Amino acid sequence: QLTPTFYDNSCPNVSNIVRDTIVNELRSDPRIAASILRLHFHDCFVNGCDASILLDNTTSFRTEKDAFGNANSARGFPVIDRMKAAVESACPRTVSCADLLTIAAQQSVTLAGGPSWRVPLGRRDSLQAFLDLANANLPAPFFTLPQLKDSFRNVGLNRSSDLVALSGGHTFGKNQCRFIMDRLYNFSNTGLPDPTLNTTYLQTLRGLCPLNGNLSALVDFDLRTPTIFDNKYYVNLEEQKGLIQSDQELFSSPNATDTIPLVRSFANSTQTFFNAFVEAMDRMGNITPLTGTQGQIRLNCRVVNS
Numbered sequence: 001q002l003t004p005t006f007y008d009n010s011c012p013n014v015s016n017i018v019r020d021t022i023v024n025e026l027r028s029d030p031r032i033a034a035s036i037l038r039l040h041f042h043d044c045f046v047n048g049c050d051a052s053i054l055l056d057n058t059t060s061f062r063t064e065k066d067a068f069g070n071a072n073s074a075r076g077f078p079v080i081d082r083m084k085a086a087v088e089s090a091c092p093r094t095v096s097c098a099d100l101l102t103i104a105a106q107q108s109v110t111l112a113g114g115p116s117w118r119v120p121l122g123r124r125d126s127l128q129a130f131l132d133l134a135n136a137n138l139p140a141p142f143f144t145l146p147q148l149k150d151s152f153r154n155v156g157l158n159r160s161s162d163l164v165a166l167s168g169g170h171t172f173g174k175n176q177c178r179f180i181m182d183r184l185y186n187f188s189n190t191g192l193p194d195p196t197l198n199t200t201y202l203q204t205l206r207g208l209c210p211l212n213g214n215l216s217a218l219v220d221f222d223l224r225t226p227t228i229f230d231n232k233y234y235v236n237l238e239e240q241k242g243l244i245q246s247d248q249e250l251f252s253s254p255n256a257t258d259t260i261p262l263v264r265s266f267a268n269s270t271q272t273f274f275n276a277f278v279e280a281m282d283r284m285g286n287i288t289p290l291t292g293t294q295g296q297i298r299l300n301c302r303v304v305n306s
């Protein structure tokens with residue numbers, strides 16, 4: 001099974017190399033940490049964290065990069081290539097892309113001001129990509145709470161704490177206007193904005209995302225601290241200021257009897273949130289991994305070794 005010390009003998013400096021790469025990238029692109037965490041999440045929700053999302057097209061299988069939840073959204077692939085190259089130089093054919101991305105996600109969270117911990121390691125890389133599975137498994141911003149719960153349970157995360165804590169990943173990063181247009185102007189064919197969206201914030205968002213405007217324009221997930229990893233995400237939800245439907249559903253859904261207290265607990269205490277986030281992150285990181293001699297230690301994260 002996975003262990004945090006997997007590379008302590010074979011590549012003791014892997015975490016440091018990953019950190020250095022992100023630190024350097026953050027200077028030119030302050031959004032990279034958020035982007036990397038999102039990559040790990042979308043890796044894990046499709047056949048487990050096996051770096052299948054990093055694979056490019058082949059004539060035998062399509063890339064997950066063209067999934068509805070990844071196309072024109074997922075980013076940072078070149079950055080992963082960079083750290084992988086650096087790590088391959090430090091320790092040839094040792095660290096899997098799956099593990100590398102997991103470490104990158106944790107380091108990204110820490111660099112953004114979040115908790116610091118050692119992630120379990122020992123994952124191996126997939127021998128194929130799963131586009132159809134990605135389209136079926138990746139949750140969408142328009143999901144209701146029951147659908148969000150179903151999506152998490154589908155991949156192995158049964159706990160509402162998993163859902164509420166991991167959703168905290170939206171404490172930083174960007175979101176396209178495209179995904180909230182319904183909430184702002186015509187929610188569920190009601191001809192009205194989403195009633196669970198704070199009316200003052202509604203005005204602000206309408207100004208950033210006017211009807212018939214640029215749907216690709218970006219908006220911050222957390223209006224309090226856009227680039228800092230903290231519990232402000234939950235404080236927002238309590239005030240009906242979650243950006244996308246799936247965020248606000250955690251606090252306002254008729255099915256939120258179990259998630260409301262979790263949202264409050266995380267909003268009330270940074271420690272409680274950070275603790276739950278690490279716990280949920282490691283559980284997500286433990287979703288159907290390839291281990292031992294299963295799969296490979298991919299040399300180029302974009303292609304299967306031949």
Ligand code: HEM
Pocket residue numbers: 031033034035036037038041072073074075139140141142143148166167168169170172173174175176179244246
């Ligand atoms: C619970 C269901 C979730 C849904 C429906 C969802 C949906 C989305 C959507 C619509 C975007 C905007 C993409 C774009 O406009 O390009 C996004 C971005 C992001 N998500 Fe999620 N997400 C969910 C869970 C999570 C989880 C579990 C994490 C990680 C622990 C996460 C981390 C992120 C980050 C950091 C970004 C910003 C990435 C960037 O700015 O490059 N999300 N998410």
Ligand SMILES: [Ca+2]
Pocket residue numbers: 042043044045046047048049050051052053
């Ligand atoms: Ca995967």
Ligand SMILES: [Ca+2]
Pocket residue numbers: 171172222224225226227228229230231232233
């Ligand atoms: Ca924040």
